[PDB]
Amino acid sequence: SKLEIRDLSVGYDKPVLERITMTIEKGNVVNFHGPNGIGKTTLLKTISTYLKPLKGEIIYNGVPITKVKGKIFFLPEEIIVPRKISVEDYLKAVASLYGVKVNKNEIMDALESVEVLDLKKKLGELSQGTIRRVQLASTLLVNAEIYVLDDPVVAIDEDSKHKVLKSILEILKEKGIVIISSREELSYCDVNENLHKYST
Numbered sequence: 001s002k003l004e005i006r007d008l009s010v011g012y013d014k015p016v017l018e019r020i021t022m023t024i025e026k027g028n029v030v031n032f033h034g035p036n037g038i039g040k041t042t043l044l045k046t047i048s049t050y051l052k053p054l055k056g057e058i059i060y061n062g063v064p065i066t067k068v069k070g071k072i073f074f075l076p077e078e079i080i081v082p083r084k085i086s087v088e089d090y091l092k093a094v095a096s097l098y099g100v101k102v103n104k105n106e107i108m109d110a111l112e113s114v115e116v117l118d119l120k121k122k123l124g125e126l127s128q129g130t131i132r133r134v135q136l137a138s139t140l141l142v143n144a145e146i147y148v149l150d151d152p153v154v155a156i157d158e159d160s161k162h163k164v165l166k167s168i169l170e171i172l173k174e175k176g177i178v179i180i181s182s183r184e185e186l187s188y189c190d191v192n193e194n195l196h197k198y199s200t
């Protein structure tokens with residue numbers, strides 16, 4: 001599976017990033033990096049179909065990306081979850097959006113990958129880092145072919161960030177294309193793209 005990005009400019013009214021041409025392959029994680037404000041979110045929201053490209057095209061296995069929305073999982077940089085739902089019910093619900101039925105054991109395997117133990121606790125009782133860990137576990141349960149994660153380990157303790165991200169990426173890169181954003185290059189990502197190269 002290949003995602004082809006050709007001559008891409010992204011933005012709302014005016015372009016913030018331009019001339020992006022790359023081939024993204026299943027199994028090779030792409031990290032788009034730079035300081036907050038450079039256009040990471042805008043780029044990732046365009047790849048995810050939420051935003052229309054200003055120029056260029058994004059084609060997945062020969063088909064326009066907008067025709068394969070059901071195959072895309074996008075995790076935004078914000079942490080917004082239903083506060084009265086349990087961890088396990090949230091995971092079941094996210095999977096159900098993709099028509100996937102998960103049992104409590106598949107749920108626990110995903111939570112184990114991010115070192116979260118209590119399935120029963122309501123999300124509103126958890127810390128932001130813990131909630132982000134649960135969101136990352138949810139990515140492991142869907143049948144998506146394209147994973148686009150904006151600031152995936154936001155809010156997670158600095159000394160735990162890399163352990164968690166590596167754990168997630170190791171699973172997701174076997175399932176599909178993975179694109180993430182961050183503030184720095186990552187040794188464990190196959191492709192690092194500094195967005196300064198494309199900045200207007």
Ligand SMILES: [Cl-]
Nearest residue numbers: 037039040041
């Ligand atoms: Cl940004």
Ligand SMILES: [Cl-]
Nearest residue numbers: 129130156157
């Ligand atoms: Cl944490």
Ligand code: NA
Nearest residue numbers: 120121122125
């Ligand atoms: Na609770």
